[PDB]
């Protein structure tokens, strides 16, 4: 076993829109190879406090109960939780 000194990287870019891909970046839809704008690391750290900005713009679910009572904003983290089916 050789040890390639590089962490796991994944293809990334605009060409992935519409493609079905596995965890390692291999297409499985069968519609040809990807057109990626370089690679990026899977395991990275998040932006710090000084690098954030507040949330004041909406994103519409298209439903009534959600978009009215429990709104979602751009940058928000919403937990959809319940039983099976």
């Amino acid at each position: 076993v050789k040890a390639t000194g590089r962490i796991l990287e994944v293809p990334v870019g605009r060409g992935l829109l519409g493609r079905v891909v596995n965890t390692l970046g291999a297409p499985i839809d069968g519609k040809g190879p990807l057109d990626h704008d370089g690679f990026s690391a899977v395991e990275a750290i998040a932006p710090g406090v000084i690098e954030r900005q507040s949330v004041d713009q909406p994103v519409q679910t298209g439903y009534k109960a959600v978009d009215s009572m429990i709104p979602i904003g751009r940058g928000q983290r919403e937990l959809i939780i319940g039983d099976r089916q």
């Binding site: 750290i45 713009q57 319940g82 039983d83």
Partner: protein, 86 residues
């Protein structure tokens, strides 16, 4: 971004941890399950225009990037008291 099932990710990580003989915790899940979900979810954020301008080396100016996340959790018979949903 949608995470269709965080609980199944947690189960896969539990299998990896136990096969590696790491010490088990509550409901046999290792303690770093919270670290897993926390370091995943906190990556979803909105960043100020200074950050965008610095990252793109000046190409994009006056814009704030943003990523919204919708994780999904399955409860067994509505038991909110379970470890992973808590």
């Amino acid at each position: 971004i949608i995470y269709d099932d965080l609980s199944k990710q947690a189960v896969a990580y539990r299998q990896i941890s136990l096969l590696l003989r790491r010490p088990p915790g509550r409901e046999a899940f290792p303690g770093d399950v919270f670290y897993l979900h926390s370091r995943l979810l906190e990556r979803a954020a909105r960043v100020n225009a200074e950050y965008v301008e610095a990252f793109t080396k000046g190409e994009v100016k006056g814009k704030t990037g943003s990523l919204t996340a919708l994780p999904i959790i399955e409860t067994q018979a509505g038991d909110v008291s379970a470890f992973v949903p808590t």
